[PDB]
């Protein structure tokens, strides 16, 4: 074919910057948060919308 449309949508997409946010916990304290979230304090999913 014709090799002239390469990069089309990647160059067409508008550029949006990442919002700065509070940093994430790491290690033994990140996996404590998941345990507290799912077991001690609680038919849908973690990322269910509306």
């Amino acid at each position: 074919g014709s090799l002239a449309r390469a990069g089309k949508v990647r160059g067409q997409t508008p550029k949006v910057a990442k919002q700065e946010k509070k940093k994430k916990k790491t290690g033994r304290a990140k996996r404590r948060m998941q345990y507290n979230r799912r077991f001690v304090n609680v038919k849908k999913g973690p990322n269910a919308n509306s």
Binding site: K43, K44, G45, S50
Partner: peptide, 30 residues
């Protein structure tokens, strides 16, 4: 008062979203 997984599965069991409606109905049942 959200969506009904039963109706979703019954209406979309043969469309592109069948694999997702089955998953949602299984989540509702179990």
């Amino acid at each position: 008062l959200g969506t009904d997984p039963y109706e979703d599965f019954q209406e979309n069991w043969n469309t592109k979203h069948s694999s997702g409606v089955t998953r949602e109905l299984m989540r509702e049942l179990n």
